[PDB]
């Protein structure tokens, strides 16, 4: 799928750590970029209005 693209969290994505972009199940993200063959990287406009980006397993989301 041509980047970028949309993707929906089938499941919460939560860690430690700050590169990670968490979500909960429902979300709707844009990927702007594909890091390796596990991984995402996207964003979408949280609660407060502020985006946040970050990486996140594919395994996670469906185009």
Same mark, same amino acid.
Request: no cysteine; glycine share 6%.
């Given at each position: 799928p041509e980047?970028?693209?949309k993707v929906v969290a089938q499941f919460p994505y939560k860690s430690?750590?700050?590169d990670d972009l968490n979500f909960e199940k429902d979300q709707e #993200? #844009?990927?702007t970029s594909v890091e390796d063959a596990e991984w995402y990287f996207?964003?979408?406009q949280d609660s407060n209005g502020d985006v946040i980006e970050g990486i996140f397993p594919k395994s996670f989301?469906?185009?």
């Open positions: 980047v970028p693209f430690d750590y700050e #993200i #844009i990927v996207g964003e979408y989301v469906a185009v």
